[PDB]
Each structure stands twice: as C-alpha cells, then as structure tokens.
Amino acid sequence: HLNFLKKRLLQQCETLKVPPKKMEDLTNVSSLLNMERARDKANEEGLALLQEE
Amino acid sequence: KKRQRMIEVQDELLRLEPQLKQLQTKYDELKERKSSLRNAAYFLSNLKQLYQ
C-alpha cells in the first residue's frame, strides 16, 4: 500500500502545474548555507572596519 | 566601492597637511619679526632723543 500511494502521489505531482523555478541538488544545502554565513560575517566585519577608517 | 573612497580621502589628507605646515611657519615667524621691529624702533628712538 505504501508503494501504491507513493506512485499515486507521483502521478498527482505529475499532473500538477507550477510556475518555473531553479536550484541545484539537495546534498549541498547545509554546506552552501554555512559558506554563505561565513562569507556574510566576513564581508560585514570588513565593511565595518573600512567604514570606521 | 568604499575602498576607492578611503584611498581618495587619504590622498586628500596627505595633500592638505603641508599647506597647514607652511602657513604655521609663516605666521609664527612674522609675529616675532614684527615684535623685534617694534622693540628696535623703540630703543633707537629712545637713544636718539637721549643723546639729542
């Protein structure tokens, strides 16, 4: 029954329509988030130092 | 964008300092010049009238 309802949900997702969007694979979500957090902090502190000077 | 602003402000300060330097030198030399001139004039007139 689980595989049956899974295939049924696959069909229901196939019949659905949605405006297009774009992204990449799901394995690199947390890594990219951490890199973006680090880059944001670095850019913020650099901009703060430059502004103080 | 902010890097260039920092660079140009540093350039402005480096260009502006020596004018202040030279103005200060001219001022504090002209002051003592005038003072010495006045003192010399006073002493010369005093001695002139004294001998007269």
Contact A52, B5 (CB under 8 A): no
A18 touches chain B (CB under 8 A): no
Q: How far is CA B34 from CA A18, A22, B30, B43, in A?
A: 89, 81, 6, 14
Question: Are A50 and B2 within 8 A, CB to CB?
Answer: yes
Experimentally, the structure was elucidated by cryo-EM
Q: What is the resolution of this structure in A?
A: 2.8
DSSP code, position B22:
H
Side chain identity, residue B45: S
Best A43, A47, A52, A53 residue to mutate vs chain B (most B CBs within 10 Å)? A53
b/e map of A6-24 (b: 16 or more CB within 10 Å)?
eeeeeeeeeeeeeeeeeee
Q: Which two tokens stand for residue B32?
A: 């003592």
